[PDB]
Amino acid sequence: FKFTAQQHVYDINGVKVGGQPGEYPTVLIGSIFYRGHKIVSDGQKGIFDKDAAKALLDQEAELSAETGNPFIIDVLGESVEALTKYVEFILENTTAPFLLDSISPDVRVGALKNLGKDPEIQKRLIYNSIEEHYTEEELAAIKEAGLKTAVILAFSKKALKPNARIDLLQGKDDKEGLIAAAKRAGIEQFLVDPGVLDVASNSWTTEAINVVKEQFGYPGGCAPSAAVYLWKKMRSKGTPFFEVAGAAVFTYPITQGADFILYGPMMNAPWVYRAIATTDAMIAYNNKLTGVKMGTTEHPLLKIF
Amino acid sequence: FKFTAQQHVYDINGVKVGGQPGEYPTVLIGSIFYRGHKIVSDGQKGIFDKDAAKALLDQEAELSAETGNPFIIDVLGESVEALTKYVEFILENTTAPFLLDSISPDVRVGALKNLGKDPEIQKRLIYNSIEEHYTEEELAAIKEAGLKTAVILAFSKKALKPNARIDLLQGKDDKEGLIAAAKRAGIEQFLVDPGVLDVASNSWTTEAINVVKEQFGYPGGCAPSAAVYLWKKMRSKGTPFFEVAGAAVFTYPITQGADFILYGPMMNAPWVYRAIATTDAMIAYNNKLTGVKMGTTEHPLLKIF
């Protein structure tokens, strides 16, 4: 199976994301400083374990080198002060691009004012996310920071059908599309995340990714970790039951041609990389029948066996 | 995914196998008395710990009840004497259908001859397998036993690519093919296993399953356990890395619409069931988008959350 639209392949500070299935390895996006992360003692002041944070980033680099799966760090914060310090640390202690991420839009906006229109911010900071309820002050903050890449959260609790993401992105009736909104903020590269409600609905998320890649060619991915962590019946079972259940959820979108996964807490990277690399390897081996050419020699198929 | 051909759904003594993606849960097939199975004290005579064997069968039934994934037991033997006793034990100690399985055709035929004409055997025993080395003696032994279901195994190093495996199944030039051979033995129900040459080529196995379901509508599955166990680089990493890699390999065919998985030793059932149930749940949630109706309420989607 191949997509009709020519696929966007973005180069975000060296990380290739997008393409036809089997062309590029899955980009894996691990969360750091999330709510309840044990390496954060004060989520308001941003007091965190610098040694432990560095160890997670070094582990991510090592797993990436082993499998060929590139990484983007999901940097979460509950306050402007905290998220600013987290981003300053991430900039210094890895080369990877990263999501500027918060539940609260004003935390993302405040952090951007602090980080400013730094050329490094423009190259490495991906805004997470341009969502249905975006504000003009949010677009102003993105434009003033000169960001070029954003996650487009193409989710609406009233665009549940995959096909309805066309309306969300392009606009409909009197409603500006999320792509138009992003472009007004000066965004040039769009990572489309159709959103995940629960584990089962990951199949609708993946169909939405397929619609977006088929018709627009934007890189498609999703964030199933919250749904997996709300699955107490599985998580309480411990090893290896939680990990293989998680593996089934995180690999599923990749089996249908998705480009990136937000796999949740970085502490899970060791098993997530091994599962995702396995799926990537099997998909790319199908290239030998389809004629799709791998865009890089740094691919699980050439590395994990 | 929805498959072109009208799908064959077989009722093998109460186990539903086949159909469109999300119609029926994955049938899981665990191996017992395999080479080096430590509950066997004498593999030539078929002497084994019956309590340990029963404990495995009870565990399978408990896991099946939990997820709604039906089970068929893969009964392996290295001698006629041993495989005959194993089949006798399985008939009395579970209600499940089972594969009569040996790497040696002489062992399968010998064991089958010992079982004679038995309606319970005819309902529950699946011949594993009709493969490239089949003989008229073997087809005659199957017909004499009155078997109605067989695994059709297209594992051949003369048939690497999916279309070559289809040629082995459907026939080509001077060869009737494995399905035609099975029909001459009186087989009316075909569990098509294209074989797994290695881990990466599980995508080729899955493409062969797709062509089978697309064109013939026969249930399709595979046995990737041997390939995964021979993956030294991943196996060397231990738990849970080996299990999540295994889960990625075993779930991949299911994500592409496969009907059954031989997951290897039954001792791995606890994590295999959890991984496969997860995939099944996501696929069945897709049913509205595919135009499919669940054929049973005994489905992971309605059980595991």
Author numbering:
A (entry chain A), B (entry chain B): 2 to 306
Publication text:
During energy production in Desulfitobacterium hafniense, MtgA catalyzes the methyl transfer from methylcobalamin (Cbl‐CH3) to THF in the catabolism of glycine betaine (GB). Despite its lack of sequence identity with known structures, we could show that MtgA forms a homodimeric complex of two TIM barrels. The topology of each subunit is characterized by a funnel of eight parallel β‐sheets connected by α‐helices on the outside that form a complex of two perpendicularly oriented TIM barrels. The active‐site cavity is located inside the hydrophilic core of each barrel.
Apart from snapshots of individual reaction steps of MtgA, structure‐based mutagenesis combined with enzymatic activity assays allowed a mechanistic description of the methyl transfer between Cbl‐CH3 and THF.
